[PDB]
Amino acid sequence: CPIARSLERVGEWWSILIMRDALQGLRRFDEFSRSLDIAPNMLTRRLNALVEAGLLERQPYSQRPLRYQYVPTAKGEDFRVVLMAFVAWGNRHYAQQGQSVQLVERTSGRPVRSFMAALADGRTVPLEQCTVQAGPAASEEMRQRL
Amino acid sequence: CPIARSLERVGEWWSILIMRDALQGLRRFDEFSRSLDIAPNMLTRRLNALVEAGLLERQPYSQRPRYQYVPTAKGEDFRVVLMAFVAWGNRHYAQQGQSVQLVERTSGRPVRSFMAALADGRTVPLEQCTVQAGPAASEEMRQRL
Numbered sequence: 622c623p624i625a626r627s628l629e630r631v632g633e634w635w636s637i638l639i640m641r642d643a644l645q646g647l648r649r650f651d652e653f654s655r656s657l658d659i660a661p662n663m664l665t666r667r668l669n670a671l672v673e674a675g676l677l678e679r680q681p682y683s684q685r686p687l688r689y690q691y692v693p694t695a696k697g698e699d700f701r702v703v704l705m706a707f708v709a710w711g712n713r714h715y716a717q718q719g720q721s722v723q724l725v726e727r728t729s730g731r732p733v734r735s736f737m738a739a740l741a742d743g744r745t746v747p748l749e750q751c752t753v754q755a756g757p758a759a760s761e762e763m764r765q766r767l
Numbered sequence: 768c769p770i771a772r773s774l775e776r777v778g779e780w781w782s783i784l785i786m787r788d789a790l791q792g793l794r795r796f797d798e799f800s801r802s803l804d805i806a807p808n809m810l811t812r813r814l815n816a817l818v819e820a821g822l823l824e825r826q827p828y829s830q831r832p833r834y835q836y837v838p839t840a841k842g843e844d845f846r847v848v849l850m851a852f853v854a855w856g857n858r859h860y861a862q863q864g865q866s867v868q869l870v871e872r873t874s875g876r877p878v879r880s881f882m883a884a885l886a887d888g889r890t891v892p893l894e895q896c897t898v899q900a901g902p903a904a905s906e907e908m909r910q911r912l
């Protein structure tokens with residue numbers, strides 16, 4: 622479908638699906654395989670890359686054969702925002718009826734129109750109104766890059 | 768540097784820096800090279816990957832011997848992802864410890880978090896949203912979700 626294609630093109634589709642399932646409690650290689658309908662060799666490469674990226678950590682599960690489960694890391698827990706963003710990105714310019722994947726309010730089924738930025742004072746502004754800039758701790762090199 | 772390192776582990780640091788430059792009007796190879804202080808092989812790898820991902824488009828600049836790279840509509844939309852990666856990388860850094868910051872452009876005011884504006888006019892924490900199957904999902908897709 623269109624959002625899978627965009628997300629594959631940008632290299633995040635499987636990471637999004639696996640991270641999502643890991644954050645929902647899936648742990649064992651076979652859980653991932655059956656639930657995501659993904660071939661083993663590819664599941665393995667994608668798990669290892671999530672691990673190398675520091676988003677999941679492998680932890681012993683059993684002895685003979687020694688098998689591992691995959692549990693999210695504090696970073697991976699935080700990565701939820703990024704995954705959600707990739708979907709809002711992928712759904713940009715697609716009408717809601719028709720969408721195969723949606724960012725919604727978990728309580729109702731209410732779809733998310735857009736991300737907003739919450740400032741310290743209470744106010745919410747659109748992202749178009751925000752910018753990436755150098756921070757107080759930034760080196761000379763960082764300042765130049767920004 | 769801390770944030771650069773986490774963002775590099777996730778394969779996005781140079782992408783963030785290049786897209787932001789492109790979104791700001793940098794076009795040519797040496798512009799990115801000097802502004803970002805990036806070596807040419809790395810820059811070639813990253814520019815090509817951004818083109819291949821459909822985020823930048825490469826157009827002809829000159830004969831003997833150059834291209835320019837302009838953001839695509841998908842690339843303009845990518846802002847939210849770049850900003851989300853920065854918020855992610857700043858999660859757990861108190862403000863005075865940050866080298867890269869997400870701020871309101873008008874004032875220097877730091878962005879504390881993202882919220883979600885909903886269809887019914889409400890705005891809730893992103894922490895309260897979820898990715899789920901949409902109305903058009905195939906059978907395969909509903910299983911994946």
Ligand code: NA
Pocket residue numbers: 628629630632633634635636
């Ligand atoms: Na993918």
Ligand code: NA
Pocket residue numbers: 774775776778779780781782
């Ligand atoms: Na990188």
